[model samples]
Target: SMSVKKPKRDDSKDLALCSMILTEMETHEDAWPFLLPVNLKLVPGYKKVIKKPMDFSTIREKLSSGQYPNLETFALDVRLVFDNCETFNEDDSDIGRAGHNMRKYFEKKWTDTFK
Candidate 1:
């Protein structure tokens, strides 16, 4: 059997602002629903909670009830934010450049994390 691993925490891996952004998204009722089951599953330990499609709705309800850890609960809210943002617009040159910059930023971050 195989398993996924959580990234190790280090002083250099500062995500205070990123975590703050996630918290803000989590508490906002309007954005909370989209994140419920899908996003929570992305985090390290919530796999069993979302093992099946039927289980998803139940998991979502539990999340809404605030029964889970705050750190692991708001993954999707960030994604929703990116989806709705105008910065990714392909037709606009400036937006396209911004998107490229965003991807470059992530690539650098990922390299730093995995190294």
Candidate 2:
């Protein structure tokens, strides 16, 4: 498991913040690559490379189901989504570039709002 110190002790606040962040990310134009699960047909050997696949809607489902134990857990999934994209797509690729921007957006929002 990833070792992370929870930024604050308020679970509800963090949960609310996560929900807001997810909404922002979901609506972004660069979110297309991360909107759904990666298609095996679209990317050969994706399953072999990405052990734990993730996406925006999937995280929304997880968040809606109340499975996010903490904000850090939610953040991890968001990072994983982009990391997988980085591995499968070249930096210059449209989808790949989207992930980069989205990653930056999330990182900025996360630290700016939470810290």
Candidate 3:
């Protein structure tokens, strides 16, 4: 029989890191367009509401409110925003680099055993 190991959960650290990443993304203009789509769905009557661009504070509220399953899922959602983004030079573009680094950051964050 194979035993499945469950990773330990650290809500504080996970929440902090998620907040940091989202905050950083907000500072990048190119990243905004991608971030908005995912954020809208989290709001009530998002489809019916026409609103301004989402800011870090709003996104942070949703994230802190347990809107996602886990930090890993939240990180993936952030990555998904960049995945669909169009950049002139993927390796050299600022948005592309940010996306690459964000994915790597979460990949390591989720797997690391030390808190």
Candidate 4:
């Protein structure tokens, strides 16, 4: 008979840490658009529409509501936010540095706990 290994349990501490990093990102104004993009999709009869960006408040609410089923899903969302802000060069400016630091925080915590 072959033996199988079960998946490891997700660490709630790391998850909360990731959320904290996201919340910190919210403190910076320049990081807002990357974390949350304006919804430019037009609606019928609407000439000019403005959409709010995604911020930590919304992220926390969704997280608290159990929107992310697992660690991977949570990480995926955070990665997406990083992807949205990828245009910033880590070596170029303060905003870029902030983004880089945010990414580093996740990477370090993720590897430390999961790997």
Best by TM-score: 2
Model 3 regions more than 4 Å off: 1-9, 38-61, 86-115
Candidate ordering by TM-score (highest first): 2, 4, 3, 1
Q: For candidate 1, write residues 2-115 as lDDT tens digits.
A: 687777656332245344443443444443323433445455543443343212234345455655454333333333333432322453555445434443443454445444
Q: Against the hidden reference, what TM-scores do the models get?
A: 0.29, 0.87, 0.46, 0.55
TM-score for candidate 1, please give it. 0.29
lDDT of 2 by residue, 34-69 (tens): 898888787789988889999998999999998988
Cα displacement (angstroms), candidate 2, residue 71, comes to 0.6
Shift of residue 100 alpha carbon in model 2, Å:
0.6
Q: Is candidate 1 or candidate 2 better by TM-score?
A: 2
Query: Candidate 3: TM-score?
Result: 0.46
Tens digits of lDDT, candidate 3, 16-91: 7677667656665554444444344675554454333333445566798988777766755554444544222266
- Model 2 clash count equals 0
| Error at 70, model 4, angstroms | 0.9
Error of 2 at 64 (Å): 0.5
Worst 10-residue lDDT window, candidate 1:
79-88
Question: Number of the top candidate by lDDT?
Answer: 2
RMSD of 1: 12.1
Local error of candidate 2 at 6, Å?
Answer: 12
